Amino acid sequence: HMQFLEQKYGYYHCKDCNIRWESAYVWCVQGTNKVYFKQFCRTCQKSYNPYRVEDITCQSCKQTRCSCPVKLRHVDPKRPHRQDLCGRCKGKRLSCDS
């Protein structure tokens, strides 16, 4: 099995393109802030870790570090996930948020 990963919230900045983005699908080594998968800048297509990681506040139970199966709804038109810029799912048929 791959090590368990912990979905967290990340803040990113590509200084070369001066593009900031955020993501609710930052995959961390569980229990840590170590980021296991890169995300890619939409303009220069280089790989980045976020400069800041935060625990997700669960929208099911309102806690951090909870055991709920889903903390943030999937398939969310108001909160898209760029599959093509995600180190975890850019090569897969189903995105992280599918």
DSSP state of 83: G
Q: Please list the residues that pair with 8 across neighbouring strands.
A: 26
Which of these segments, 2-10, 15-23, 26-34, 72-80, binds Zn ion (CB under 5 A)?
15-23
Binding residues for Zn ion restricted to 25-44, rule: CB under 5 A:
41, 43-44
Q: How far is the CB of 74 from Zn ion (least distance, A)?
A: 11
Q: Which residue of 32, 47, 60, 98 would you call a contact of Zn ion, by CB under 5 A?
A: 60
CB atoms within 10 A of CB 8: 21
d(CA 29, CA 34): 6
The strand pair at 5-14 and 52-54 is best described as antiparallel
Interface positions with Zn ion (CB under 5 A): 14, 16-17, 41, 43-44, 58, 60-61, 66, 68, 86, 88-89, 96
